[PDB]
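Regression test attached.
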Amino acid sequence: GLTHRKFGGSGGSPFSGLSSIAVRSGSWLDAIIIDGVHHGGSGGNLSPTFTFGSGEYISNMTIRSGDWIDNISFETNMGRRFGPYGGSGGSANTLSNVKVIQINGSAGDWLDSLDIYYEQY
Amino acid sequence: GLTHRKFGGSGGSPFSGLSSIAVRSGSWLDAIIIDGVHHGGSGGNLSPTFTFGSGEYISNMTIRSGDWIDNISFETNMGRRFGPYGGSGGSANTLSNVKVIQINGSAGDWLDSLDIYYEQY
């Protein structure tokens, strides 16, 4: 099942492959843009890009969803916030006191689902 | 601890926030470049970029390491290969029959450690 392994030694500053997030949104999420890579369709309006600093990660996140993704927001361990973007359909679900490791998902003409991998503290 | 949750509904094509990989390497790994975002120093030579197709993910991976990262290669579930890049110090460790979810790590003037998060089948 889901696991992790470290390789290598002590030094340096932390980084994550989850380096920046933006979305396209209207009433719902048309796309999520991860590290500048577009996932979803061309609809809605493009949000600003949120870029994580070294050692900064998502610690609280709310995803509103039903059959598809309606809304997203998150806060980092340094107190910064992204969103909300999207609308008010579906129901809110919240991850709190976490460290988000990755955001995978499925998308076509819009953003259908998100797979969040995270440490729960 | 480490976990995952899905939000949303059925449709669309799979995607991952781990979308492409390149490295800078010489005798060792000077940098890893994830989704075009540079992690590490300016030394060595830049490899080509490997870009995952939808539904394509790392299924086997070898990381050679000691105090730092010496070498990396991987194969995908579609049979494509990246690397090896780097040199022959340290010792080889292999993840096999997996699905890599994320590559985090620590880097400074070069690539010091990698945190691989993955499903073990």
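Expected vs. actual: identical. The first strand of chain A starts at residue 2 and ends at 8.
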